[PDB]
Design a protein around this ligand. Structure first.
Ligand SMILES: Nc1ncnc2c1ncn2[C@@H]1O[C@H](COS(=O)(=O)NC(=O)[C@@H](N)Cc2cnc[nH]2)[C@@H](O)[C@H]1O
Ligand SMILES: Nc1ncnc2c1ncn2[C@@H]1O[C@H](COS(=O)(=O)NC(=O)[C@@H](N)Cc2cnc[nH]2)[C@@H](O)[C@H]1O
Lengths: 372, 376
C-alpha cells in the first residue's frame, strides 16, 4: 500500500503552485531590473566542499547534511546551500578572475534539521551573490534589492532589517577575552560607509552585535531580514581563495522561499493568481471530437496568451459546464453537431450567462473582447 | 581545489539566458492547454521507485542514487517524475474521481555513463493526465508536444514513433505483439492514429518500441531526432492505467510523458544557430565624483519604477569613465546615464547613447521618457 512523502519534503499541489509562480515572477523581474544574471548549479557536490567552505565546526556540516558514498566511493553531499556551490563553479569556469559577476539562483536546498512550521528538510532558496566589489556600496545595492521585493510583494510593513559587522580573523582572535570592539578601522569604516548609504536610501535598519550566522565564510558585512527570518547573507571575501581561486571580494544573501510565500499569504490574505483556465471548450455529439480539437488549436494559434482547456471523455453539458466552472473558466465555447454543420460555435459568458452563436472565423475576436 | 561531480553540469550566465527563453515558450504552450504545474520532492523512498518502475529495468537495477537516512530509511534521488506525481496524487487525494492536467519541471538523477544527451543529473519537463481513458487525451498530449516544436522552430528536426503494448494479459500471452493486443487496446490505438491523421501529425508505428519502465499499457511513444548517436529521443511517454492502483490509490486511467530539457536546448541551438537572449543590461549607470554614490543609486531606484521592463545596472567600484563605458559595453548596455558632480547639483543626467556615441544632458524628470524612446 501507500508510500508517503519523506518527512520534511513537500508537495506543492496545483493551487499552491500558482501563487508561487506569481511571486517567483515578481522576484525574478526585480532581479532583472538590477542587471543580475541567473546561474544554475548542481544539486549534489563532493562533501569536502561544504566541509571546507562552510566549516567543520558548523552545526550544518556536523549534524545537518545529507551525505552518501557514490558507487566509485566518493563522499557526496546534497547541497544545504548554494554559495559554496557558486564559488566552486565560479573558480572552475573562471568567471571570477578580476571579473565582476552579479548572479542569482533558485532551487531546492537540503538540511537534516527537525521539521518546524518555517523549517523543512527540502526547502527552497532564491539567492544572490556578487563577485569583484569590495566597498559597502555594493552591499547597499543588495539590501536595496531585497527592499524592492518587499515593496513589490506588499510586505514592507512586516520585514525588518538587522545589520552587523565582524571584521575578520584578527577582530576575533584578538577579541577572544571576555562586541566587535576590536574591528580594525577599515571595518568600522566599511560598515559605517554602508550604514550611511542605507540611510540616504531611507531604509530603516537596526544594528545588533548579538547577530551571528551559522556559516563560517562571512567577513565584514552581515545581515538578516526578520519577520514580526526570511532572508540573510553577508560578505565572504576570502572564500574564493579559501577554495582554490584567486581571492576576490564577494557578498550575497539567500531567501527562504517557503517563508516568503507564507508571509506574503499572511500580509495579503487576498493575494490570488490567475485562473488556470480562461476558456473551456465544450462539445457533445458524435464526431465532434476532431472538430473540437481542431477548433481548439485554431483558437490557440489566434489567441496565444489565453488558457483554453478542451473537455475530453464526453460528459453531458451540465457536467462540462460544471468542469469549466471548476477551473475558473470565464467563457465556454460550445461546439455541438449543429455548430459543426453551421460553421459556428456557441460562446457562453459564464459570468453573465449570455450566450451567442458565432461564425467560427469570428469567435477569436469575439473571445478577445469578452476576455477583455 | 574541488570540481563538479562528473555528469553534473553548471549553467553559466550566458547559457542560463537561453534556457529561460526556451522554458518560457514551453510554459506558455502548457498554459494554452489549461494545464497546471505541480512540484514534488527530489528525494523519495526507494520502494516507490522499485514498485512503480519495476525491478527488472535498468533504472532500478543499476541507475538509482539510493542512500540511507539518519534512521535507517532507504532514500532515493528521483530518476523520473511520474512515480512521485502519483505518490502525491494519492497522498493528497487529488486523483480520486478527478481529472488533473499536470506538468512539472526539475532535476532527475540516473547513474549512467556521461555522454552527449545523458547526464547523471538532468532535467525533465513532464506532463501527466489523470482520469481520461479514451484516446482523445492521448491525442492532445501529442498535439501539445507538436505545438512546442512549432513554437521553438524544430518540427523539421523531430519525428514521432507510436505503438500500443496492449494489456498486461495481452503482453503475458506474448511468449510481433500486435497479434496479441486485446480488442479494446487495438481499437483505442486506431482511435489515436485516426486522431493523429485528422490533425496532420505524421507518425511511424514502431512495433519494437520499448520504454525503459514497467508501468506502461496501451499507448507508448517517443519523439526522436536526426539519429543522434545513442541519445536521439527527445521526449517519451505513454499510458499507465494501473499505476495509481498499484501504488495504493483508487484506480484511474493516466497518460503522460517527459522531455529531456538538455536535449531540447541542444536541438534548438543546433537548428537555430542564432537563437538569442536579450542582453542582461540595457542601461548602465556611469557616475563619478564626490558622493555621487548615494545619488546615482537613488536615480537608479527611481528610473526602475518609471521604466518597468528595462534592465539597469549601476556601476560600482569607482573607475574612470573609460573603464565604465567599457563595463557598459561589456554587459551589452545600449545606453548609459552618466551622473557626475555637475548633473547631481543641476538635477540632470547625461544620456549617452552607446550605439551612436552622442549624448545630451537631460533633466532627471524627463530622462525616463528620453531613455524609453531609445530602448524601443
Ligand atoms: N530548513 C529550512 N526551511 C526553510 N528555509 C530555510 C531552511 N534552512 C534555511 N532556510 C532559509 O535560508 C535562509 C538564509 O539563511 S542561510 O541559509 O542560513 N544562509 C545561507 O544559506 C547563505 N548561503 C546565504 C548567502 C549566500 N551568499 C552569501 N550568503 C534563511 O533565512 C531561511 O529562510
Ligand atoms: N540521463 C539523462 N540525461 C539527460 N536526459 C535524459 C536522461 N535520461 C532520460 N533523459 C530524458 O528524459 C526523457 C524521458 O525519460 S524516460 O525515462 O524516457 N520516460 C520517463 O522518464 C517517464 N517518467 C515519462 C512519463 C511520464 N508519464 C508517463 N511516462 C528521455 O526521453 C530523455 O529525453
Amino acid at each position: 500500500k501507500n508510500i508517503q512523502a519523506i518527512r520534511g519534503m513537500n508537495d506543492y499541489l496545483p493551487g499552491e503552485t500558482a501563487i508561487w509562480q506569481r511571486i517567483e515572477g515578481t522576484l525574478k523581474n526585480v532581479l532583472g531590473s538590477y542587471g543580475y544574471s541567473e546561474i544554475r548549479l548542481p544539486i549534489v557536490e563532493q562533501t569536502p566542499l561544504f566541509k571546507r567552505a562552510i566549516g567543520e565546526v558548523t552545526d550544518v556540516v556536523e549534524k545537518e547534511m545529507y551525505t552518501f558514498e557514490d558507487r566509485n566511493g566518493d563522499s557526496l553531499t546534497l547541497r544545504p546551500e548554494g554559495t559554496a556551490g557558486c564559488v566552486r563553479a565560479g573558480i572552475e569556469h573562471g568567471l571570477l578572475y578580476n571579473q565582476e559577476q552579479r548572479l542569482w539562483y533558485i532551487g531546492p536546498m537540503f538540511r537534516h534539521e527537525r521539521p518546524q512550521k518555517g523549517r523543512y528538510r527540502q526547502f527552497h532558496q532564491l539567492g544572490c551573490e556578487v563577485f569583484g566589489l569590495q566597498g559597502p556600496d555594493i552591499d547597499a545595492e543588495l539590501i536595496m534589492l531585497t527592499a524592492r521585493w518587499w515593496r513589490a510583494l506588499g510586505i514592507s510593513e512586516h520585514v525588518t532589517l538587522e545589520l552587523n559587522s565582524i571584521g575578520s580573523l584578527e577582530a576575533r582572535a584578538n577579541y577572544r577575552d571576555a562586541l566587535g570592539d576590536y574591528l580594525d578601522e577599515e571595518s568600522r569604516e566599511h560598515f559605517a560607509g554602508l550604514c550611511k548609504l542605507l540611510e540616504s536610501a531611507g531604509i530603516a535598519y537596526t544594528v545588533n552585535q548579538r547577530l551571528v550566522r551559522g556559516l563560517d565564510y562571512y567577513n565584514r558585512t552581515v545581515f538578516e531580514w526578520v519577520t514580526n527570518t526570511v532572508c540573510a547573507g553577508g560578505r565572504y571575501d576570502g572564500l574564493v581563495e579559501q577554495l582554490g581561486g584567486r581571492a576576490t571580494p564577494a557578498v550575497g544573501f539567500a531567501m527562504g522561499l517557503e517563508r516568503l510565500v507564507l508571509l506574503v499569504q499572511a500580509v495579503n490574505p487576498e493575494f490570488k493568481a490567475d485562473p488556470v483556465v480562461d476558456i473551456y471548450l465544450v462539445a457533445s455529439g458524435a464526431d465532434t471530437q476532431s472538430a473540437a480539437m481542431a477548433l481548439a488549436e485554431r483558437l490557440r494559434d489566434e489567441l496565444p496568451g489565453v488558457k483554453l482547456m478542451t473537455n475530453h471523455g464526453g460528459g453531458n453539458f451540465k457536467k462540462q459546464f460544471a468542469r469549466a466552472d471548476k477551473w475558473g473558466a470565464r467563457v465556454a465555447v460550445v461546439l455541438g453537431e449543429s455548430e459543426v454543420a453551421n460553421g459556428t460555435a456557441v460562446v457562453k459568458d459564464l459570468r453573465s450567462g449570455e450566450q451567442t452563436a458565432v461564425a467560427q472565423d469570428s469567435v477569436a475576436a469575439h473571445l478577445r473582447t469578452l476576455l477583455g
